[PDB]
Write a protein that binds this ligand. Structure first.
Ligand SMILES: [Mg+2]
Length: 243
């Protein structure tokens, strides 16, 4: 349970983002990075680019995770995602910006110790596919806790549809228009899933604390995308706030 700080940085208003006919805010205009910032940074990392109306991570600028600068709570996110052959990325939700102080200097902690990830992956050609228990490291899974069933991912190079819903602590992941798992935050079963994971209280104290109390006191958090050194695209990014 170390000394941790949560950084509070400016969040944009949703008013600035148009809403579509079904009520979903469009938080990527297909042309610009308005509303987006690199986690732990004051600027869009340069390996993130706009390619053909997609946000794209240029594998091989500075890198790091990219977030949208609005804290969501009850919401339904929809995204399309394409990976290149062997690509790894992911979609983060309820994230917090965290720092610890070691040796009098502030250091950024990764977003994945504060919040869940919906993995993004070429399941056919990437070694993480093999590496969990029961596929919990293949695409759409809650990475290293809960597998996606069914695993209806398309082959690399194609656009996949992702849904992440969080409603009053209930979470559902969607892939290509099926719901593929469900869990419940801030419960003992949640506590348990964490004790089985790499975020176990013994294997990683500060992660367990943040994940068990996911979304802080106010249960709200940033959405974002993972830099994991590989080529990936996202587009049609929209989010409905829930009422
Ligand atoms: Mg990943």
């Amino acid at each position: 349970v170390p000394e941790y700080t949560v950084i509070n940085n400016a969040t944009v208003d949703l008013a600035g983002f148009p809403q579509d006919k079904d009520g979903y805010y469009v938080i990527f205009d297909g042309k610009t990075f308005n509303g987006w910032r690199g986690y732990g940074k004051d600027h869009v990392p340069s390996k993130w680019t706009i390619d053909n109306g997609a946000i794209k991570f240029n594998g091989s600028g500075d890198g790091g995770d990219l977030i949208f600068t609005h804290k969501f709570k009850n919401f339904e996110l929809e995204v399309e995602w394409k990976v290149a052959k062997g690509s790894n990325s992911g979609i983060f939700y309820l994230g917090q910006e965290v720092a610890t102080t070691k040796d009098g200097k502030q250091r950024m902690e990764p977003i994945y110790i504060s919040c869940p990830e919906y993995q993004v992956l070429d399941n056919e050609n990437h070694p993480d596919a093999k590496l969990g228990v029961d596929g919990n490291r293949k695409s759409a899974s809650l990475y290293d806790m809960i597998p996606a069933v069914p695993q209806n991912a398309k082959p690399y190079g194609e656009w996949n549809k992702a849904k992440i819903m969080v409603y009053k602590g209930t979470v559902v992941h969607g892939q290509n228009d099926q719901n593929v798992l469900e869990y419940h935050l801030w419960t003992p079963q949640w506590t348990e899933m964490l004790e089985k994971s790499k975020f176990s209280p013994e294997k990683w104290p500060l992660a367990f604390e943040l994940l068990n109390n996911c979304g802080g006191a106010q249960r709200e958090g940033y959405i974002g995308f993972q830099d994991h050194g590989d080529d990936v695209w996202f587009r049609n990014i929209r989010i409905k706030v829930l009422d």
